[PDB]
RNA sequence: UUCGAUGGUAGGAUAGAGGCCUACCAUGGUUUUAACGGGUAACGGGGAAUUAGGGUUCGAUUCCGGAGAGGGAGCCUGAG
RNA sequence: GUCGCUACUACCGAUUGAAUGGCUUAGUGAGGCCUCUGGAUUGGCAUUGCCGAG
RNA sequence: CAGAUCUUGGUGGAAGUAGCAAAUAUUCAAAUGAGAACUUUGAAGACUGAAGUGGGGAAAGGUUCCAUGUGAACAGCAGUU
RNA sequence: ACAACCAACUUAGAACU
RNA sequence: GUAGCCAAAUGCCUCGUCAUCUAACUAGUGACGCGCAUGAAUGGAUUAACGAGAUUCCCACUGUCCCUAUCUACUAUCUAG
RNA sequence: CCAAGCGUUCAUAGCGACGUUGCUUUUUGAUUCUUCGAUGUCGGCUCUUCCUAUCAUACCGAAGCAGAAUUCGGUAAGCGUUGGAUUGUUCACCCACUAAUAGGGAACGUGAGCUGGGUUUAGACCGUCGUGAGACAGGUUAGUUUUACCCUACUGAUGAAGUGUCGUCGCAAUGGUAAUUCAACUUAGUACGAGAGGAACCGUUGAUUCAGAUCAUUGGUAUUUGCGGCUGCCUGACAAGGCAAUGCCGCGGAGCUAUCAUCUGCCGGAUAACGGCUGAACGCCUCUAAGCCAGAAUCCGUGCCAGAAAGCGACGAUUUUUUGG
RNA sequence: UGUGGAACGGGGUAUUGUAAGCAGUAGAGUAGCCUUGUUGUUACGAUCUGCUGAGAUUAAGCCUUUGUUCCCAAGAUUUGU
């Protein structure tokens, strides 16, 4: 029983929530949503989107 | 096929027709699905298979050897998604294959690239061939 | 040639709307009169679906001893009224009522049950009745001693309360709820000794119990046989359209067989599903109704924001493995199980280890309030 | 001559000259006296065999120089 | 000189020819190296800013 | 005359049924009037977007042109038009 | 051999984002 | 019977024989020809380019399909005429 | 049916000529009884039902150590009988899976269900024949597939009351019905067997097909035109907007939906084949002559769906000081 | 006339992604004037940064509400053991 954390959102992870996809160099990626997936797809960084918490903690947001 | 015993049913994302890469090093790399061991009756159903399963596969790309037969072959990676008992769902980044026999011992020596972990439990030689499971 | 199996099942006929939505008990369990005097059935109603994660304890299989996520749903069941009693001949005609007892009062869930009209109607529904309870105390005796000595089934008439609920109905759902105990004299009694008396979920059900659902399906409208059987989509060629069936009958039999799929009304049925396994008997009471043994957040059964089109549970519920019939908010009859069961998957004891209570109206990632609060630190809302 | 092929200036790098490398400026350099490409069952030489003379053939191999340590590539130590 | 039978030699040839090695095109890229960062830990200075390092 | 897929005329069931769905789109207020979704005025929103749903002609039509009145028939709904 | 403006459309390149 | 062509739009036997292609082809292509009944301006062979001509295959692509699902507008539906 | 026999030897364990008795023919044939004021033409797709002349699954009977295979042998049509290359084709031959890929009827089932690949005779080419127009055991190419709004049938949807009226709770006569198959594992290296070999009653874990539901998660869907972004034009500019028959793109709640997701899918009786009991006659003997047991995926029932709209039961109040009961 | 309903508003829950406006020399640079500049005065400048997990939507088939304002104690038809 634990709560995992999202490769791109960063945000936690209860089961049954997301999906998981493992890459070709055998690097595992959990997404909480179909958003985070897609932009993850898209090649978009979570340390550009404002509502990722990479984002946050590299801006100091909250201190 | 009396490997290790039985497997939960998945999403089956590799039907007949499919082409999959080859994760061996026997000199294969466009496994192209001919048919599924294990399939029933049912009209119009294409006999689709998901990893761990024992389909049979022609090679279309690879050493000239290698063509213009039928060998058997284990699914290790597919791209569509399948659930476990935990309720995760799970993918791959492309469809993989590996060339074996029908007892299903490896024809190669190595596996590039991760596996399945319903696969590795089938089927013992794959996962003593392979590195990184799920 | 090419055989292949059929498309639906001739046994689920007609396709037609049901005569009814609250859903009737067909065949109650078969009467053990060793057993304790207990009640046969319960009503309830769908709150909506959630998780579960628990450990498996089935020996032999690959997840044994490991997380397994289950789809589970939700039945709020306050506690029933008992009202009435009913007995039943056994004429060789079948069952056949012999006489109806009610209790002194009747409260107004029950009564709204029998006038379309309720604010504009005089309210006189059990007003003779009241009275000759009140100053006669002989006449309800002398019904109940002939259910007695006759009468050897035994039904209790039990409406429930749906004023406890978040619904807007105030028209309570009677129903006729058989007692499985013994000795008819004895369900008698204990019939007039619940007379006016709630009757809990707890009482009529345990943990881990096999027991039926029964309820109307969900109204879908007509539909065609492509969705209503399930036959094979019509090429792209076809002219005048593809989602039909293409031969509907032969020559001589000269006429359309009733084994042949048409368009027509594709949902609101009566169906009654076997084998539904209790995984938690909730109270209403108590502020851990969610929480588990591994989990011990102080959290209801309630997701963050509410039940989608439901509402809050305040009142006992009861947790069942899978789906059952119906849309949210339906009113679904729990029925003790006809069968007998001895397999290890039935008989295995359920232990829950976590309760999802996230959000259902999206993708709901907080379980608690506290949990977002504590996530979303401060907001702008929350500075000033 | 693209992605340095020929030359000038300036710089970088090297223990050190140098298109070794970089920016700019000119279209230059070789070649029927065979450039270039290809083959060599070609490591090169002192040397060996035959011996009128001239020549022909061989030379992995006891001496000298070069390359390699299964095929490449990178690097520490150390004057090397 | 044509026609012969045979052992064997060589040529062309559909099979959009196959099978090794250098020369290059495009894509990706292990590895060590140079450089920009990072200060668990060692810390002299109830204290508290400064010399410091792998 | 009961017939001739008879002739002429009238009239039925089908039946208040099939249907009156191409061409983006109408809305508000006032006037008139017995009657306004279709008339007129104003406002708004739109389309044709110069190879036009604009302005003229040849052929063809013949008064359809204009004003004032009408709403029996036509304008397959309506009408004060 | 210089040169104060008015009136013109292209082509190529660079940096940033 | 040529300086040719063919199981060809011309071959009944025939799904002719060999090879290629495919896991599998009565299809296609390349060769053979006692060719039932090919053949030289009743024109024969080859042929670049061209073709809304016929035919075989490959890559890309996709609801043609596995296996169907969802959405929009106009109908169908009900109402006034 | 017959038996000379093959069957090392034993006549029908398995075959068994010559004759003879029959059934079917979906093969073409024969005839011309219906139809020429007109019954749309093959195949394929789709869909339902029926038959047994049984491929598989269920239970029985035989030979040889088992183990397998054969007899499909005996009942049995309940339930299944697939994906592809070729041919328009049915048939047919191959590649595989599977327990198996059985054979047929329903106007050679099924064109106001579809398609038009075959036929398709109007255009055109070739081969053969004919002087010719033209002809064909032939080959090839292009070639309009109309109408239901009527009755009935079928699928769903309302619905009047003489038995009072309006409601609530019920019974079930009748009609329908549903589950199916496979794999692996502890029996175990067990029984059996000179050795080698290798089961099974049963249980457990899963899976295939089918059926009924459901939307907690995941996927899909976008008129949430919800949010953001983008191009051309327009409202003087910013801002905010509009048009581009839904302008385009990303995400997108809710709903719907997916063997693309999840859940669920019993046991009682009567039997067929066949095996027994007491037991004679035919003093022996034998399941049968009377009767009684066991006995199949068979049949009927429990259960599940509908509920006679002219089958029924119990219960509630019986137009309020106008008037009616 | 009621633990009433409706229309708004509030809160929660969800979707998207940081609104307009202001300020900052952050910004590749560009152009004029003089005390001549290790925060130059002047002006423009895709973009960037801070207010800002902001702004917008949030039932139309989400939940809740003690908040505000209204509305209902009506009308027509049929019904007798």
Same mark, same amino acid.
């Given at each position: 029983?634990?709560?995992?954390?999202?490769?791109?959102?960063?945000?936690?992870?209860?089961?049954?929530?997301?999906?998981?996809?493992?890459?070709?160099?055998?690097?595992?990626?959990?997404?909480?949503?179909?958003?985070?997936?897609?932009?993850?797809?898209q090649?978009?960084?979570?340390?550009?989107?404002?509502w990722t918490?990479?984002?946050?903690?590299?801006?100091?947001?909250?201190? | 096929?009396?490997?290790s015993?039985?497997?939960? #049913?998945?999403?089956?994302?590799?039907?007949?027709?499919?082409?999959?890469?080859?994760?061996?090093?026997?000199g294969?790399?466009?496994?192209?699905?001919?048919?599924?061991?294990?399939?029933?009756? #049912?009209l119009?159903?294409?006999?689709?298979?998901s990893?761990?399963?024992?389909?049979?596969?022609?090679?279309?790309?690879?050493?000239?050897?290698? #063509?213009?037969?039928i060998m058997?072959?284990?699914?290790?990676?597919?791209?569509?998604?399948?659930?476990?008992?935990?309720?995760?769902?799970?993918?791959?980044?492309?469809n993989?294959?590996?060339?074996?026999?029908?007892?299903?011992?490896?024809?190669?020596?190595?596996?590039?690239?991760?596996?399945?972990?319903?696969?590795?439990?089938?089927?013992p030689?794959?996962?003593?061939?392979?590195?990184?499971?799920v | 040639? !090419?055989?292949?199996?059929?498309?639906?099942?001739?046994?689920?006929?007609?396709? =037609?709307?049901?005569?009814?939505?609250?859903?009737?008990? =067909?065949?109650?369990?078969?009467?053990?009169?060793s057993?304790?005097?207990?009640?046969?059935?319960?009503?309830?109603?769908?709150?909506?679906?959630?998780?579960?994660?628990?450990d498996?304890?089935?020996?032999?299989s690959?997840?044994?001893?490991?997380?397994?996520?289950?789809?589970?749903?939700?039945?709020?069941?306050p506690?029933?009224?008992?009202?009435?009693?009913?007995?039943?001949?056994?004429?060789?005609? &079948?069952?056949?009522?012999?006489?109806?007892?009610?209790?002194?009062?009747?409260?107004?869930?029950?009564?709204?049950?029998?006038? =379309?009209?309720?604010?504009?109607?005089?309210?006189?529904?059990?007003?003779?009745?009241?009275?000759?309870?009140?100053?006669?105390?002989?006449?309800?005796?002398?019904?109940?001693?002939? *259910?007695?000595?006759?009468?050897?089934?035994?039904?209790?008439?039990?409406?429930?309360?749906?004023?406890?609920?978040?619904?807007?109905?105030?028209?309570?759902?009677?129903?006729?709820?058989?007692?499985?105990?013994?000795?008819?004299?004895?369900?008698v009694?204990?019939a007039?000794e619940?007379?006016?008396?709630?009757?809990?979920?707890?009482?009529?059900?345990?943990?881990?119990?096999? *027991?039926?659902? *029964?309820?109307?399906?969900?109204?879908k409208?007509?539909?065609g046989?492509?969705?209503?059987?399930?036959?094979?989509?019509?090429?792209?060629?076809?002219?005048?359209?593809?989602?039909?069936?293409?031969?509907?009958?032969?020559?001589?039999?000269?006429?359309?067989?009733?084994?042949?799929?048409?368009?027509?009304?594709?949902?609101?049925?009566?169906?009654?599903?076997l084998?539904?396994?209790?995984?938690?008997?909730?109270?209403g009471?108590d502020?851990?109704?969610?929480?588990?043994? !591994?989990?011990?957040?102080?959290?209801?059964?309630?997701?963050? &924001?509410?039940?989608?089109?439901?509402?809050?549970?305040?009142?006992?519920?009861?947790?069942?493995?899978?789906?059952?019939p119906?849309?949210?908010?339906?009113?679904?009859?729990?029925?003790?199980?006809?069968?007998?069961?001895?397999?290890?998957?039935?008989?295995?004891?359920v232990?829950?280890?976590? *309760?999802?209570?996230?959000?259902? !109206?999206?993708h &709901?990632? !907080?379980?608690?309030?506290?949990?977002?609060?504590?996530?979303?630190?401060?907001?702008?809302?929350?500075?000033?």
């Amino acid at each position: 029983m634990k709560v995992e954390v999202c490769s791109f959102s960063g945000s936690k992870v209860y089961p049954g929530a997301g999906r998981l996809f493992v890459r070709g160099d055998n690097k595992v990626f959990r997404f909480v949503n179909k958003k985070s997936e897609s932009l993850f797809l898209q090649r978009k960084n979570p340390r550009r989107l404002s509502w990722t918490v990479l984002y946050r903690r590299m801006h100091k947001k909250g201190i | 096929g009396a490997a290790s015993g039985t497997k939960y #049913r998945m999403t089956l994302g590799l039907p007949v027709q499919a082409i999959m890469n080859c994760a061996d090093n026997s000199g294969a790399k466009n496994l192209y699905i001919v048919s599924v061991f294990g399939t029933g009756a #049912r009209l119009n159903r294409l006999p689709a298979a998901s990893c761990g399963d024992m389909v049979l596969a022609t090679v279309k790309k690879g050493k000239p050897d290698l #063509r213009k037969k039928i060998m058997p072959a284990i699914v290790v990676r597919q791209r569509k998604a399948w659930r476990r008992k935990d309720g995760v769902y799970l993918y791959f980044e492309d469809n993989a294959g590996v060339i074996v026999n029908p007892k299903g011992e490896m024809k190669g020596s190595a596996i590039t690239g991760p596996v399945a972990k319903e696969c590795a439990d089938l089927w013992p030689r794959i996962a003593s061939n392979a590195g990184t499971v799920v | 040639k !090419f055989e292949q199996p059929r498309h639906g099942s001739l046994g689920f006929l007609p396709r =037609k709307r049901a005569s009814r939505q609250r859903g009737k008990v =067909k065949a109650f369990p078969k009467d053990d009169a060793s057993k304790p005097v207990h009640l046969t059935a319960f009503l309830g109603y769908k709150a909506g679906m959630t998780h579960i994660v628990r450990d498996l304890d089935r020996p032999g299989s690959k997840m044994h001893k490991r997380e397994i996520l289950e789809a589970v749903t939700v039945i709020e069941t306050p506690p029933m009224v008992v009202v009435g009693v009913v007995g039943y001949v056994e004429t060789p005609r &079948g069952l056949r009522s012999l006489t109806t007892v009610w209790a002194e009062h009747l409260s107004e869930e029950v009564k709204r049950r029998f006038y =379309k009209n309720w604010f504009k109607s005089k309210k006189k529904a059990f007003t003779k009745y009241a009275k000759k309870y009140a100053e006669s105390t002989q006449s309800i005796n002398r019904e109940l001693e002939r *259910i007695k000595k006759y009468c050897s089934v035994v039904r209790v008439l039990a409406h429930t309360q749906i004023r406890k609920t978040p619904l807007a109905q105030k028209k309570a759902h009677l129903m006729e709820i058989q007692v499985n105990g013994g000795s008819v004299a004895d369900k008698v009694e204990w019939a007039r000794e619940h007379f006016e008396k709630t009757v809990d979920i707890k009482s009529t059900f345990e943990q881990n119990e096999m *027991i039926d659902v *029964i309820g109307v399906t969900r109204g879908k409208g007509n539909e065609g046989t492509t969705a209503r059987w399930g036959t094979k989509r019509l090429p792209r060629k076809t002219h005048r359209g593809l989602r039909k069936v293409a031969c509907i009958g032969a020559w001589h039999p000269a006429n359309v067989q009733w084994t042949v799929a048409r368009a027509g009304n594709a949902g609101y049925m009566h169906r009654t599903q076997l084998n539904s396994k209790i995984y938690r008997i909730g109270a209403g009471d108590d502020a851990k109704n969610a929480s588990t043994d !591994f989990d011990a957040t102080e959290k209801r059964i309630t997701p963050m &924001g509410g039940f989608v089109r439901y509402g809050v549970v305040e009142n006992d519920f009861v947790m069942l493995n899978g789906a059952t019939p119906g849309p949210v908010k339906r009113v679904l009859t729990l029925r003790k199980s006809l069968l007998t069961h001895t397999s290890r998957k039935a008989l295995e004891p359920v232990s829950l280890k976590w *309760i999802d209570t996230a959000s259902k !109206f999206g993708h &709901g990632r !907080f379980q608690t309030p506290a949990e977002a609060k504590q996530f979303l630190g401060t907001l702008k809302k929350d500075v000033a």
